[PDB]
């Protein structure tokens, strides 16, 4: 039944399902797709008495079905309401074995496994103690979050389900303060909407800094003035109604639960910024409290497993021996015999990215006999080993022919954590399944990759023998380190500031490192110098690492956007990352956390253990906020196709879905809808490459005429925005594009009762086969830069539309209202004159709003020119630029966000992708034969210069974000040499004055203007 692993896509008229029977017989029953398990049981027991041995039959509801699903797992189908199609049956057979355990816990386990995408019995059947310990210990933070969710219920539960979308800072920028009449907002309030049809609208002239309590007070004082004039005491009796009303964004699922300034809410601030009237509505608080479901959380079955010891281990700092690792043998290397001559194993002790010792290699051996049995020697002492040390090694091949110049190439890489999660040094025999080398990688070793063996057993494996020191060796406690601490015993203030001001990726010299370490005590006065200080210390010692631990212990907290750098791959130490997590806990707001949730998810791969402080912080934040939890689940699910991070992300998703509450129903509905869409796109792709659009249209309407697809594609929250509800699916507008990669356009409807004034149709483009992760990163950067410009005082508003990846090369793209590509602009109305776009904007709107459209166009152009020059996005053709009707334009296809074309067609491109076309000059200059000397173009230059200077001043954040996204796996983001492009484009090394000169020279080279 569907899946197309061993079966076929499920389209039978009537499907045959075979049935067993506990007495030892088999029953053949033909049924329909829509039949339920009870329905199957009816004809099962109708013929059970017809068959012999009917006396052994028990009662009708005396036992439960069981069968085998497509995930090669045995499922006890306790839910009797499931239809015959969605059972994911691998073989059309059924069995009954009678129930043996708790029904609700296995129902919950099935829901968790479906939302995850793989059954949790895989997490049950693992012999690794770390996985079981993580699953046992993460329920502590799960239970703490669940208990926090009911502190002052029903208020806290409402805050969890509908968290307030608030701007990060209560302060309001100057460019939008002047859009209010004496600092006041006009809001429209819809009240008492009911079957009585007494819909009313009230316009309230209220200040920007008001609270929803004041808003409902004004609303009820304006509503009560019509029904009664009041005798100046009747109006005072409204003190019992302020607790009975809750604001809601009209046409959306956003409630104003928390007491905040109204201008701090993102909906109100957006309405102020774009100029639309903020339209809210009132409702009874009892309705909101009754509509939310009961929140339940029960401890799972795998807990309560708690009921080896010799000489109480030994401290690692008492060893007086070097480090020896024996390379025993490789089971196989999959390389040609006659072509490739010899192979060898290259190893090396690493800490983050920098090695702690010189790399050593085994003797080169032919492929036929991959046996070494050699004790590799490293020039690092055992006590010199840091806590976060790792053994990075790989199997490499050498081609020493054609006149020397050996062509060393990697075959398979791997990393071993030198310390267990229980602080114990690695000892004894060990076998590692080597990972495949990633595509387009040059280095011999892979220290950026995650540790652990390959779960796949058709991969090369190497046998590692570690030295044994007569007992298990444990890393010393913090008390021993503190005992070793303190045992070691001007114009320099400006130099520390100069070091702190530069970007984290700048050049650091040996004298700078020595100066930083010699002034490590004075560095407390500048808390921002911590990353430079951590690069200054060398971790292949003991006393200085103890000293740095002592310094980090008393280090003052720093900015979230600065301590968030301390979580990337360069800093693997548990103390440093714990300090960064403490800074994030005490300083990062929930809104900024949702801003950088994607990077915080992607830096979970650099963690060397599953159970640590960052994952607990992220889970505690996700379980107390459904807006954060939605994107937490989707970001963890989008990377589950990757086998290299499947296990830890799966365990995290299992914990989350165990304690996420009643959001499992909505997440499962989203999973069902997106899985049906993936199946439809796969069927239409693999089979209809050479069919005209009429054939795909008729096949799509036939597939969407089916009852199951309709029943699965209504009434679920949009994954792009959980507040938006995707109700009825109108098939009139759903269509297939011109088949770039066969994108799917889908139109839904708002099920909200008060939604006619807002948009009634929700459009999302479904793209399968295109990697959307670079687009999400580009749009996040666009959003952050736009926020920086709006905070600074520049009204350079752009359009970072929604884009989310939900799986392997598949995802959703938000569609905006009334936008036409410049291809579509010149397609109609006339071999195109230079005045085409300006005339089109004149025709679309004229009069007093012509100037607003023109200056909105100029500001959008300035913002996007600066953005695409700085980021170096792929070459902006005239088909990737779409302009709205009101004037604002935007870009859509961010294929490569860091050029990625500098290696091919030459070596140094450094190009400007988005150059001002002559039509853009004409429309920006309001239409003229000349464009350059126009003073409006001088204003455009001023906008571009100010935007570039602001981004250059804030470039540290973007560099940190790219360094955090480094380990995700995008092809153009694989090393810091990729981030060197964004470092060079902003000209961090040059000073502030000549960086603007470089920007001006580039912008003149693009425009061919001497200026």
């Amino acid at each position: 039944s569907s899946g197309e692993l061993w079966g076929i896509h499920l389209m039978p008229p009537r499907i045959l399902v075979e049935c067993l029977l506990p007495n030892g017989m088999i029953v053949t029953l033909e049924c329909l797709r829509e039949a339920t398990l009870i329905t199957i049981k009816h004809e099962l027991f109708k013929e059970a008495r017809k068959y012999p041995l009917h006396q052994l039959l028990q009662d009708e509801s005396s036992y439960i079905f069981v069968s085998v699903t497509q995930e090669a797992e045995r499922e006890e189908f306790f839910d009797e309401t499931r239809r015959l199609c969605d059972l994911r049956l691998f073989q059309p057979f059924l069995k009954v074995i009678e129930p043996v355990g708790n029904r609700e816990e296995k129902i919950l386990n099935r829901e968790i496994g479906f939302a995850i995408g793989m059954p949790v019995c895989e997490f049950d059947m693992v012999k690794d103690p770390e996985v079981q310990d993580f699953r046992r210990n993460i329920l502590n933070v799960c239970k703490e979050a669940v208990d926090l969710r009911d502190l002052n219920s029903p208020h806290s539960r409402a805050m969890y389900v509908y968290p307030p979308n608030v701007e990060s800072s209560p302060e309001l920028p100057k460019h939008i303060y002047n859009k209010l009449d004496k600092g006041q907002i006009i809001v429209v309030i819809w009240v008492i909407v009911s079957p009585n049809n007494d819909k009313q609208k009230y316009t309230l002239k209220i200040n920007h800094d008001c609270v929803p309590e004041q808003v409902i007070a004004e609303a009820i004082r304006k509503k009560t003035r019509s029904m009664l004039l009041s005798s100046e005491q009747l109006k005072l009796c409204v003190l019992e109604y302020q607790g009975k009303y809750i604001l809601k964004v009209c046409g959306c699922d956003e409630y104003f639960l928390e007491k905040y300034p109204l201008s701090q809410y993102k909906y109100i601030r957006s309405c102020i910024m774009l100029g639309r009237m903020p339209n809210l509505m009132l409702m009874a608080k009892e309705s909101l409290y009754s509509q939310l479901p009961m929140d339940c959380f029960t401890m799972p079955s795998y807990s309560r497993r708690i009921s080896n010891g010799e000489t109480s281990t030994k401290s690692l700092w008492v060893i007086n021996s070097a480090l020896r690792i024996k390379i025993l043998c490789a089971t196989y290397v999959n390389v040609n015999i006659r072509d490739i001559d010899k192979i060898y194993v290259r190893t090396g002790i690493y800490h983050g990215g920098e090695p702690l010792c010189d790399n050593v290699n085994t003797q080169r051996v032919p492929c036929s006999n991959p046996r070494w049995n050699e004790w590799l020697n490293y020039d690092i002492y055992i006590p010199d080993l840091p806590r976060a040390a790792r053994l990075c090694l790989s199997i490499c091949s050498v081609k020493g022919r054609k006149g020397a110049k050996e062509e060393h190439c990697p075959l398979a890489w791997g990393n071993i954590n030198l310390f267990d999660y229980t602080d114990t040094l690695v000892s004894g025999k060990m076998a590692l399944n080597l990972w495949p080398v990633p595509h387009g990688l040059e280095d011999l070793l892979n220290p950026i990759g995650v540790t652990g063996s390959n779960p796949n057993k058709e991969t090369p494996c190497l046998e590692l023998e570690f030295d044994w020191f007569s007992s298990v060796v444990k890393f010393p406690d913090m008390s021993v380190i503190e005992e070793h601490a303190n045992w070691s015993v001007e114009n320099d203030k400006e130099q520390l500031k100069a070091i702190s001001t530069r970007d984290p990726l700048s050049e650091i010299t040996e004298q700078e490192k020595d100066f930083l370490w010699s002034h490590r005590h004075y560095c407390v006065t500048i808390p921002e110098i911590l990353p430079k200080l951590l690069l200054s210390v060398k971790w292949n010692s003991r006393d200085e690492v103890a000293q740095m631990y002592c310094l980090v212990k008393d280090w003052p907290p720093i900015k979230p956007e600065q301590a968030m750098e301390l979580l990337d791959c360069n800093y693997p130490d548990p103390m440093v990352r714990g300090f960064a997590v403490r800074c994030l806990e005490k300083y990062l707001t929930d809104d900024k956390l949702s801003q950088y949730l994607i990077q915080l998810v992607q830096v979970l791969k650099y963690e060397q253990y599953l159970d640590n402080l960052l994952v607990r912080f992220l889970l505690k934040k996700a379980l107390t906020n459904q807006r954060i939890g939605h994107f937490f689940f989707w970001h963890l699910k989008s990377e589950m196709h990757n086998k290299t991070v499947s296990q830890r992300f799966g365990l995290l998703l299992e914990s989350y879905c165990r304690a996420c509450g009643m959001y499992l129903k909505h997440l499962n509905r989203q999973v069902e809808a997106m899985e049906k869409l993936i199946n439809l796109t796969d069927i239409l792709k693999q089979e209809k490459k050479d069919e005209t659009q009429k054939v795909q249209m008729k096949f799509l309407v036939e597939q969407m005429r089916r009852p199951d697809f309709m029943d699965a594609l209504q009434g679920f929250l949009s994954p792009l925005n959980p507040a938006h509800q995707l109700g009825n699916l109108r098939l009139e507008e759903c269509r297939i594009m011109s088949s770039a990669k066969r994108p799917l356009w889908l139109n839904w409807e708002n099920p909200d009762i008060m939604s006619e004034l807002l948009f009634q149709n929700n459009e999302i483009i479904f793209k399968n086969g295109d990697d959307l992760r670079q687009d999400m990163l580009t749009l996040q950067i666009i959003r952050i830069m736009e926020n920086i410009w709006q905070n600074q005082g520049l009204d350079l508003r752009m359009l970072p539309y929604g884009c989310l990846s939900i799986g392997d090369c598949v995802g959703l793209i938000e569609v905006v209202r009334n936008s036409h590509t410049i291809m579509q602009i010149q397609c109609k109305g006339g071999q195109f004159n230079s005045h085409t776009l300006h005339q089109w904007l004149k025709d679309k709107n004229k009069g007093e709003i012509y100037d607003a459209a023109i200056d909105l166009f100029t500001r959008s152009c300035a913002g996007y020119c600066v953005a695409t020059f700085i980021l170096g996005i792929g070459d902006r053709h005239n088909s990737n630029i779409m302009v709205k009707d009101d004037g604002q334009l935007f870009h859509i296809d961010f294929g490569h966000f860091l050029d990625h074309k500098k290696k091919k067609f030459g070596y140094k491109r450094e190009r400007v992708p988005f150059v001002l076309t002559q039509d853009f000059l004409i429309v920006i200059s309001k239409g003229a034969q000349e464009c350059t000397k126009t003073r409006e173009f001088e204003r455009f230059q001023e906008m571009c210069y100010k935007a570039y200077l602001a981004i250059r001043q804030h470039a540290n954040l973007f560099i940190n974000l790219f360094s955090m996204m480094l380990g995700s796996g995008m092809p153009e983001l694989q090393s810091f040499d990729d981030i060197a492009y964004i470092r060079k484009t902003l000209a961090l090394d040059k000073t502030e004055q000549e960086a603007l000169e470089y920007f001006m020279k580039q912008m003149n080279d693009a425009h061919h203007g001497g200026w």
């Binding site: 692993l5 061993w6 072509d339 010792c357 091949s397 190439c409 058709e458 010299t509």
Partner: protein
Amino acid sequence: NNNMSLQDAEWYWGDISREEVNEKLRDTADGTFLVRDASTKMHGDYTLTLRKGGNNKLIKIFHRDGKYGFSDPLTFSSVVELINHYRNESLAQYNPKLDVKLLYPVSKYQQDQVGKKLHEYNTQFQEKSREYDRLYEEYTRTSQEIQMKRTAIEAFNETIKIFEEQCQTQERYSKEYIEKFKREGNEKEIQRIMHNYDKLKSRISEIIDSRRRLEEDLKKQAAEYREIDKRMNSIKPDLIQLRKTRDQYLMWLTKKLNEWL
């Protein structure tokens, strides 16, 4: 040594970025030094890239009052003289960071062995580049299909395990209907209990046949997937080595050189 000019030095490279230095100083033995200029673009910057302990170390060279030196005091007249002295010595006067000696220069002259001799090398690059991606494209397809088939035998293994127990449920209950229903025989349902028995037994024969067919059906492309890895690794170093061919052909020229191809 001699009063040799700064620009034409064997070890010196001008206007070379950090990434070129990092890729050139790869898998390199200890003591290798490289002199370049900083990206800060002031005159007399002269960063020195000494690779010790597996990672490159940057050492700044100062230009105070026409004299050179890593740190105060400065007593070196020429940076060429400074590098020659540090090749003679082993960094003993500075901090004893293993006291390595400048031994292996990164020479642009000790290598190898105008528009006409460049078009022929560009044509052969594209044909082999697509083949390596062609092998990788079906490498992903086969690997994903193997995993889809690897779990299939596991799925069949459960069904065999379910049905093998199911026939045992009949067998453990076979003894009770041996005689009391064979009392009648001809018109009694004992003609059906074996008829029911062979129905399921024939069914498990097909599943164990399909599992047996899938047992060797999986290994046919698995060796091919093994062979594709053999074929892909037999071409991987050539792609890496043909990339370096631009290193010896972008000199002596630096127009539309990037456009001619």
